[PDB]
């Protein structure tokens, strides 16, 4: 079972610029292990899986979590450590291209729909449960739980918002593009841990290791 | 995988 | 208006291994054309929004069809040109990781919920009307004709498939895979470019032009 | 584009 109360609770129970960012990411790497033993029966796999799923995961997990943190920042986004960061600044940084496919892509579009926490929180919990992450020990499982969520989620949409019949395969549909930008960050962040001059924390390097 | 499976537990 | 009909009739329509599978690339993006026009109200959008959803979302739509087409094949691929890929033809001629990802994350799952062509053609159809491609003159246009699809295409599952509520959102839970896969293949068909040992031919030389 | 707008003719 798969209640959308309790991935809510996950949510609440949470809540150079680039130096900034990576500096942000790395404070919440901790926070996202908390939030993922809060989700329901993640704590119950295997421990080898769970860290299959949280080194998968985490750069989209957390891509999500501070796009949404950002709806009401003009042109900008809200870093957990209280900052802004500013398009023109990342621009300034190095990094725009990726930057704006975040605002567009992203950040507008929760805004525009006005994405609610327990759908960010279903979204993340799907996106968590990637059936398709190698080394898996049981990838039936994973799916089983995915497949809880998505039907957790489509249940708690028609039920808030049954004006918008399209409104859970709207949030899905925002996979592919968080998957493609998180590609991309990984990209990025392995540049800059070859370049050398930018400061990376140890949990973030950590996951940047093979 | 130090940090992560440290925090798992 | 989207009639699941029309895109089944779209689909049913058009119905060094490396340079085999880029030989049986290039075919298809004239095949992909075709059926690109027979989408209702493809081509009714501006010429230059045709030309940029054809451009950003072809790799991703011939992966989509070859995977499907191979549901019968063990361990391969089956090519447009009438050959077989096997997963270690694949991995002889240097691709075996990506190939791989395709046989397990969608040639596979495709086989396993056994995707009819009605599901793949509108799958299609979601991934043609990418509204966040860049450049469109109008994405809210874009974005209306997926809402579009996937209303059709779930209101098809519902009524085929009653026993699987969940099947809707599995569909579009392939997406997120489609994407990361057509991102590698493209990545390895610039350096495939790049290097210059392997022969590419016109149409598919220019869908890898700026 | 030169092939892709003269087959979308
Ligand atoms: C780590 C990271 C890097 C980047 C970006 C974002 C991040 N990440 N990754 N996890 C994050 C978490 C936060 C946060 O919670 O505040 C902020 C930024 C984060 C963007 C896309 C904003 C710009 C591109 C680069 C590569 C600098
Ligand atoms: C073009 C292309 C390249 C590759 C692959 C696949 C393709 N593509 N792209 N469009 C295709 C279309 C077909 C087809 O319809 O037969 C076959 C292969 C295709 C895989 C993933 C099978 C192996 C990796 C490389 C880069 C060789
Ligand atoms: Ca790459
Ligand atoms: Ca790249």
Same mark, same amino acid.
């Given at each position: 079972?798969?209640?959308?109360? *309790? ?17 942000? @990411? ?42 949404? *943190?950002?709806?009401?920042? &003009? ?22 291209? $990726? ?17 609610? &926490? ?7 919990? $799907? ?6 992450? &190698? ?33 859970? @395969? &709207? ?28 400061? $990376? ?10 | ?9």
């Amino acid at each position: 079972d798969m209640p959308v109360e *309790r991935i809510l609770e996950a949510e609440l129970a949470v809540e150079d610029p680039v130096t900034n960012i990576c500096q942000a @990411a790395d404070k919440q790497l901790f926070t996202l292990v908390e939030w993922a033993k809060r989700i329901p029966h993640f704590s119950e796999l295997p421990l080898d899986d769970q860290v299959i799923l949280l080194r998968a995961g985490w750069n989209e997990l957390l891509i999500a979590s501070f796009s949404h *943190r950002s709806i009401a920042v &003009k042109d900008g986004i809200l870093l957990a450590t209280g900052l802004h960061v500013h398009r023109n600044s990342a621009h300034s940084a190095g990094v725009g291209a $990726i930057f704006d496919r975040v605002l567009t892509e992203l950040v507008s579009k929760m805004r525009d729909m006005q994405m609610d &926490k327990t759908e960010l929180g279903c979204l993340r919990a $799907i996106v968590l449960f990637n059936p398709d992450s &190698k080394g898996l020990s049981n990838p039936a499982e994973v799916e089983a739980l995915r497949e809880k969520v998505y039907a957790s989620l489509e249940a708690y949409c028609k039920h808030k918002y049954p004006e918008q019949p399209g409104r859970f @395969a &709207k949030l899905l549909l925002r996979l592919p593009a968080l998957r493609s930008i998180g590609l991309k960050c990984l990209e990025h962040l392995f540049f800059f841990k070859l370049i050398g001059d930018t400061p $990376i924390d140890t949990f973030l390097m950590e996951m940047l290791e093979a | 995988h130090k940090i992560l499976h440290r925090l798992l537990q």
